[PDB]
Amino acid sequence: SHMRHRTLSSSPALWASIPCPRSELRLDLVLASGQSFRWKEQSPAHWSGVLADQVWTLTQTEDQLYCTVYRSRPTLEELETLHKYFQLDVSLAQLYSHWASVDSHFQRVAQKFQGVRLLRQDPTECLFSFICSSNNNIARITGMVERLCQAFGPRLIQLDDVTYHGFPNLHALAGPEAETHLRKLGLGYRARYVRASAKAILEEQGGPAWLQQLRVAPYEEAHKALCTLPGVGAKVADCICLMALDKPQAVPVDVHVWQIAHRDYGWHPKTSQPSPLANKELGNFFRNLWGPYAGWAQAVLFSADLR
Numbered sequence: 063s064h065m066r067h068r069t070l071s072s073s074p075a076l077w078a079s080i081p082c083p084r085s086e087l088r089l090d091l092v093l094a095s096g097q098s099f100r101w102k103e104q105s106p107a108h109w110s111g112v113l114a115d116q117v118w119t120l121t122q123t124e125d126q127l128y129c130t131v132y133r134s135r136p137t138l139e140e141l142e143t144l145h146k147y148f149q150l151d152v153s154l155a156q157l158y159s160h161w162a163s164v165d166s167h168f169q170r171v172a173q174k175f176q177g178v179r180l181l182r183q184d185p186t187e188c189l190f191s192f193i194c195s196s197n198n199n200i201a202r203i204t205g206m207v208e209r210l211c212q213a214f215g216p217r218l219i220q221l222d223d224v225t226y227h228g229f230p231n232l233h234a235l236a237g238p239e240a241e242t243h244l245r246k247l248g249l250g251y252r253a254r255y256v257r258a259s260a261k262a263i264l265e266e267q268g269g270p271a272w273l274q275q276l277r278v279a280p281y282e283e284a285h286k287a288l289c290t291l292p293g294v295g296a297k298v299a300d301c302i303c304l305m306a307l308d309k310p311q312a313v314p315v316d317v318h319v320w321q322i323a324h325r326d327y328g329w330h331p332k333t334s335q336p337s338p339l340a341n342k343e344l345g346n347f348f349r350n351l352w353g354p355y356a357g358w359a360q361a362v363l364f365s366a367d368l369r
């Protein structure tokens with residue numbers, strides 16, 4: 063039978079519910095605010111994309127986050143995977159308070175941008191999503207991640223005129239053919255780096271259990287370990303640390319962070335010398351204003367900066 067992208071209108075039988083205030087999560091602010099690049103609004107206010115090799119459509123009211131899956135409706139198993147994805151364990155309201163009480167600029171911005179939170183992403187997925195492109199702009203990375211998924215990850219399902227592949231496994235990326243293929247897709251020289259990091263993870267660190275150990279490790283160790291990988295520098299490593307390795311204190315520094323720091327906070331390098339040195343300084347700067355969940359505080363201001 064031909065499968066359509068579902069709505070709350072087309073087939074109510076096929077939806078479960080997670081009790082979730084629109085104060086703790088706005089999907090229109092999280093799913094395409096530069097954290098994950100695999101979610102798409104196919105029909106109005108309905109978010110469809112791949113998660114852990116299963117296709118989901120998501121939507122919400124003021125009370126309830128509504129979920130449907132494409133493999134019948136979601137289990138406890140499958141709803142516990144969304145609960146940990148959105149990190150609903152953590153009270154965002156108790157962060158938007160603590161960030162308010164130290165940051166007057168937050169309190170003004172955070173009126174209009176409620177319910178921005180971090181996703182807990184898959185380490186492999188996140189790592190390769192950030193090394194396949196410049197990270198110039200959301201649209202660039204979103205297209206590259208799709209091309210990458212279309213050619214290296216297994217076909218999963220058709221929905222309307224759209225075919226969903228899963229995120230590539232390390233073996234598909236690590237093969238002796240990977241680069242020449244990846245360069246078809248437009249990755250340029252970053253095709254070298256995609257292969258070599260996959261090769262490195264499988265054949266020198268024990269495969270993805272390595273990244274799970276970094277998730278267990280403290281921030282500094284995982285960062286450092288992430289930078290030994292080809293194609294990974296300081297910004298990408300903090301992205302991964304923040305977004306996949308449970309390091310809320312990570313503050314990935316790039317030219318938008320600089321722009322926000324300077325215009326909105328009055329910040330300049332105390333070194334008096336953008337550089338490796340000064341960027342490290344700016345991330346120290348933000349950790350010390352915002353606290354242990356500093357990245358999550360960045361997330362809000364990034365949503366606010368895209369509008």
Ligand SMILES: Cc1cc(C)n(-c2ccc(CC(=O)Nc3noc4c3CCCC4)cc2)n1
Nearest residue numbers: 095096097199200314318360361364367368
């Ligand atoms: C026009 C414009 C304005 C902005 C802020 N971007 C933009 C945003 C996002 C990305 C991808 C990226 O790098 N995301 C992140 N890096 O650190 C963080 C994130 C996401 C969550 C909070 C920590 C690229 C561009 N584009």
